[PDB]
Structures are given as C-alpha cells and as structure tokens.
Amino acid sequence: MGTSSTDSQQAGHRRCSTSN
Numbered sequence: 026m027g028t029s030s031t032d033s034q035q036a037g038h039r040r041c042s043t044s045n
Contacts, residue, residue, distance in 0.1 A: 028036065036044070
C-alpha cells in the first residue's frame with residue numbers, strides 16, 4: 026500500500042538493499 030511511482034518492479038529492481 027503505497028506505490029505511486031515505485032511498484033514491485035522499481036522497488037524490487039533499482040531500490041535500496043533494505044526495502045527503504
């Protein structure tokens with residue numbers, strides 16, 4: 026709940042190494 030511009034992709038691709 027909260028992925029305006031960071032879905033499972035952007036979040037699970039080019040995101041921090043701690044689910045920031």
